[PDB]
């Protein structure tokens, strides 16, 4: 499912992510944007061979397993085909375990080079929440 944008801030706030460890509901849209344009069955593969999934591309060298990826960890105890589902529900509460790791929303680069500072509340703007 690729969601429109107001649409997936209403799933977020739902879910409980508006102001989750301080992250009010634009950097969590913008950082949807910017990861999987909105498509919840979105796949990358990277370098070192792990695989991020989702409208958040969670990777699976930490968080999911997807039994392809060796020496991972599956801390949020889901496969990582779980988060290409159109219910949003386990990208979510694994966003919230990553987000509270120490690192903030900086454990996503791309939240980190192209939302971290900017005028984030634009990403929900219009939308009725
Ligand atoms: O980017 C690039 C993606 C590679 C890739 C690998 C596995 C599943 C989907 C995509
Ligand atoms: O334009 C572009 C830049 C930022 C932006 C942010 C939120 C919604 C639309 C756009
Ligand atoms: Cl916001
Ligand atoms: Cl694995
Ligand atoms: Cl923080
Ligand atoms: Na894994």
């Given at each position: 499912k690729v969601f429109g944008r107001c649409e997936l801030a209403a799933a977020m706030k739902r879910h409980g992510?508006?102001?989750?460890?301080?992250?009010?509901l634009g950097n969590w849209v913008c950082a949807a944007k910017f990861?999987?344009?909105?498509?919840?069955?979105?796949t990358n593969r990277?370098?070192?061979?792990?695989?991020?999934?989702?409208?958040?591309?969670?990777?699976?060298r930490w968080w999911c397993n997807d039994?392809?990826?060796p020496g991972s960890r599956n801390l949020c105890n889901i496969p990582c085909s779980a988060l290409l589902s159109?219910?949003?529900?386990?990208?979510?509460?694994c966003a919230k375990k990553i987000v509270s790791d120490g690192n903030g929303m900086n454990a996503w680069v791309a939240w980190r080079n192209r939302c971290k500072g900017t005028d984030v509340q634009a990403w929900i703007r219009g939308c009725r929440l």
């Open positions: 992510l508006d102001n989750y460890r301080g992250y009010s990861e999987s344009n909105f498509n919840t069955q979105a990277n370098t070192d061979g792990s695989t991020d999934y989702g409208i958040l591309q969670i990777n699976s039994g392809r990826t159109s219910d949003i529900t386990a990208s979510v509460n």
